[model samples]
Target: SILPEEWLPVLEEGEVHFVRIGELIDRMMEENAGKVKREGETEVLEVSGLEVPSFNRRTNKAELKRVKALIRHDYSGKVYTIRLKSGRRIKITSGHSLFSVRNGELVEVTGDELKPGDLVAVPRRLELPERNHVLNLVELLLGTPEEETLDIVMTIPVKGKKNFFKGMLRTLRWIFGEEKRPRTARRYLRHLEDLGYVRLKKIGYEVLDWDSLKNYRRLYEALVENVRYNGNKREYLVEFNSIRDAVGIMPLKELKEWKIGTLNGFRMRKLIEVDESLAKLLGYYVSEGYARKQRNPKNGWSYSVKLYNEDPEVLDDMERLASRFFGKVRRGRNYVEIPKKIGYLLFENMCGVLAENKRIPEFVFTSPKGVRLAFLEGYFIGDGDVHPNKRLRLSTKSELLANQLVLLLNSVGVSAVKLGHDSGVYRVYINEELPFVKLDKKKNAYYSHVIPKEVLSEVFGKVFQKNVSPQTFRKMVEDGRLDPEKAQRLSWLIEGDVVLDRVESVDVEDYDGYVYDLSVEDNENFLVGFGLVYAHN
Candidate 1:
């Protein structure tokens, strides 16, 4: 069907007739989008892509319905009683769907209570006429106007005024000419942009539009040309041919051919292109890359995702990576950036915690060992540092990610632990140096069996701090008046110092979020950002 029969509005008992207008528009939108579901089901429906419509077993495909608001309201089980002037009372709670009439149109009330005199629309059992507005089919299938009242009675084209044969002919012709859609929609959307009615978001502008598009000229015919009554039931037949004419990149017929089970959501590509390069780049980006929406959303150009660094080589690597995938790379003042559209999609696919939130994507954990290593490597290089003793250290603000990182390393038998918190951010350290050592309580240095009592006299003329700097020993020679022989011996004793062993923890930075810090098998100390992705922002 061009649209499903269930896309039509319903009648209710004891409820007011909202045959046309905002309430009808809102209900059609919500239920079709799968937002409204009967509460307390014994078995949960395998629901996923709510925006994609449900399918029909007999019909062999899915259906799309238009609605005004795509909102899902779940009441917190707190019901309130309303007392009317007529001495009648109605009680409602968070679990029940409710709405208020403001300025003569229905408004779905998710929060806040209506005053005693306020008009409310409650559910009741009622019946619809055999023939309702042919315009509703237009309103639901075609895009509904942003306005509360559009007066489709006056605005609709006269094709609906034609005979069935003429209207059918027009529909056939329009489908063949569907290639003109992008130009028409683009022109119309550009007009909206010029009028300041809406702004075009640069991040995936083409992508978002492709996700939600419809054939307007044809759905109008699907409504007007069809008859209304068959005994007690009225059938509005939307031919399936009309659907293929107005489709997005995701064609429905292709979906049916795949015979995928349970159409709870759209057929999203698995991102199987995720390989070593993608993984490493994703890791580094999340470690040092960043995505930010414009302060004023009206200027969608404000959505920026940048991969940055002071090292020209590192920046160049990022540039090459962007080219391999999304292409069209540009240089930001500080770093190289993929186009806003590609960058947004790339980062979002990894479930970036940048911009809107802070969390790691599941792909990182689920990926093969090589891919995960690349991701961690990216993050580590961004925030990691090599120490004098070879201990690695990394930092972060997401504790959940930190634990995951540790687990990732532990799976490969890598070891790490959190050192402690300092300054504002938490820190993690690698165990390159064995914790089982001779630690100078006061001097803060570790020594091996080399630091026997007999060796002390050879190194220090008197009992002294082992951790003293070279400059201090130079002055000590002047005080001791030691000859070149004793000084030379002392210097030789301290020469063979550092000893080896290995181990890693992460302490996340304390920010607007919880920090996760982890140390892994890498020789380099890494503490990744979101975009260390410098999303650390």
Candidate 2:
């Protein structure tokens, strides 16, 4: 009934992985605020706000199913962490059921019953439609109103502030009631001078007008419990309810939901599509890119975006794509200079400037299959390698990149495994189909995900009746010692849409936190993690 908030399900919309399950549920609830229904005494939000790639037993394929509800509640109990051989982890309440193979059939096994080496079913592919993603680069750069509000909140020197600080009228009254001290309630206000030329700090606040000023009335009233200090402190120590009270103008930035019609004196597309080339560019950017900020004596600061690669072909494509999307593309021997706008977009949306912090952008999750695959192609071409055995291996110092790569691979139906290598680097190996199109000579080299014969024998022994040894179990299948129907069923075991990954470890820990779950329309299971790991509802 409960899972750790860190669990990430295949989401249908929005940014940010549901690292906190309860927080995501709240996000869905808020999105469908008007559609939330009530079931007697309890408030229920039954909208199809989230989605999961569920494995259908009858169809033997993974399908994207709309979630009926997202459930969350305070939980205090022992939780089990099921770590799969593919580096997928699911932390859930001990009583929660998971899809595990037993006695040659799919059965609901509780977390308490799961153990190491157990064969658990997880989805191989996520079947999601490619919704047209119209990315507003301005929003991506400057950020949204909510983010700006949070930015303002952080600057408000409040005591022990969590999310927001309480600015009660009573507090303002108490501050002003200090009659013994010679203090006047004065407001130190900061406002943006222009509606046309919005600055990033003088920057993020929206332009003030009579209509907007009326909304600021409360802020003004709640503004300045204005504690003028007894000492010769000229500046007012303002105590405001909202940022607008402290600053004369509206604190919200995305008040107009700004979109850039032009950039660097050039008119550009208001909405940019995350098509094949764009996706590939983003991929390569995440892998081999940098947005370096340079301090200037005359002009304050400026940014330069650069892309690097050893392969000449990758650099060529990067240069061509950058020129097509962005206005200018400067080249180096093994690198290309990208526009600052595009470069900052990559840093803001996808990952940081460093290799260790590189990660998949959340937007890519909802992208089309071809776009997603193209992104991977660019990524592999930039940083991936092919082993003599045809295994596609990509090593990264970033743990987030390692886990996220697994998810990106899963999107296009490629199941990969992550290994923790020496010195904090992780290696992601894809033995599944080669997920690339741009790599020419390497296309012929291929590998597949294989369930070890030992694991198959272990599965067969559970289903086949008799005192069959693990070694003998293999011979029975080879020597036709079992029924044809039973053999057929055994063959079907490894032939499904799910991967039969070995359970590496089953550890238990004391947990006293909220766990979350999703209630689907008809499906009894949902996939979790960037790994798209499976779990029963």
Candidate 3:
């Protein structure tokens, strides 16, 4: 067992009671270098030197330079009143720098009654010791005991432990270095394989040629290891066989004899043999012109082989077969002639009504019955006055009415023509007529007759006020005479001049009917003046 030692320093006689004055001065200078002031004077003591003599109780060892005066402790409290020669007083409470002191003061212990000079040594202001030094000191003194206890408990052979630790460190370093450089691990693995440390099978690896490994690395990485890989070569070989069989046949002969309903039976059978997916692919081929669809409108959809490369004779034969299937092109009447005739009939009816009435009717009235009757009677009956014939023929009054009615019909897309009948009757013909119920419903809700009240008021107000111009009034009435009717109307409404407070009748007589006369009192004189002015100009 080992023991630790501690030592403490002892002081000489009288040294224990007296202060180290020089050390105290050094500390005060360091703390209050710029702050210290001289006693009883403006001048301050600059601490030039510091020395510690052997402490003694008999000597007044403390000395202060630039000291003007010294006063004894007067107050009962610890605070000493120091009065300097310059008339400034400082109250110092204690010897410590942290103790309270008044402005312009330096604290020094004097008087020898207690212990001679300053017995108390002012502790140096601690410069903060470095963190490492404090921590290392604590660890060294306190930590060694624990460490020794642990060493006693372990009691293992040092050399053996060191060897074991060194091996572990070497292993960790190798692992860390490999992690830093991944390519080194790959090289190591390769070296192991080359040296036959592990067989290819034992390593669970395979070497793939460039073509064999085409995109395999990316696919293997993207998909899980369990995902199976499939090759297209087997399907390609099957398709090649089917194509060979198809190419072996004379295509022209097959097309000529092939039933349009079952034209591609052989190819479709081969397609179904492969896979349903292949059948779908073949269907796309027919749609995309790789195979031709032989459409029989009377039957249904069917297909035939279309050669990408064919001999000229085979192509010519195929063309001939296609021509037969396509059928002969026949010259026939254009279908639009019927609609053209109907349009012509409408035009003739329009012109006839315009010519007979001298002016085209304002509107064309439309009705299915009216349109049918006009077409039939105008085109068939020629001219008639009999009751039955008149019923068939559109009347003059009806044609005129049709003109007005036609305006309403023509407002919509329906074309209505005047049938040369009464004003309310019109002939309506359309390539397509909209449903009557929908048309009637739309007309009732949103047609022009449904004008808003506000719009009506604005329009009427503008119209009536338009004729009441200043020039109209000046021209119609003489300067002194006003028309009673005009004046009453203007006062109440037009000019808005009537006083609401006054109970005035709106009748012309109340305002004097004489206002209606346009003649002025001096009309003859005014005319004379007017002629003189004109002559002067």
Winner by TM-score: 2
Give each model's whole-structure lDDT: 0.36, 0.59, 0.22
Clashes of each: 52, 3, 33
So what's the TM-score on candidate 2?
0.66
Q: Residues 313-411, candidate 3, lDDT per residue (tens digit)?
A: 323432343222223211212100111111122222222223234112111111233332232222211222112311122233333223322222332
lDDT-superior candidate, 2 or 3: 2
lDDT of 1 by residue, 1-537 (tens): 000111112123211111222233344444565544444421112222222111111221222221222222222334444333211223333222233333222343421244534433211111111111111122122332223112112111223222332343343344346443342344444433443433556531222232123343343344445322223222222222233224222233222222110122111121235576776677667667877555465653434567877777677777887666654678766687664532454365454644323345454444565665666666665543412334456665654454445434432324323233355443454432322222122233212112323233433455544434434555656787434555664442233211111111111111121111111111111111111100000
Off by over 4 Å in 2: 13-18, 26-47, 141-267, 297-299, 350-357, 386-390, 397-400, 419-426, 435-448, 451-484, 490-495
**lDDT agreement of model 3 with the native:** 0.22
Give candidate 1 misplaced runs (Cα > 4 Å). 1-272, 295-300, 353-357, 384-389, 419-424, 432-537
TM-scores of the models, in the given order? 0.34, 0.66, 0.11
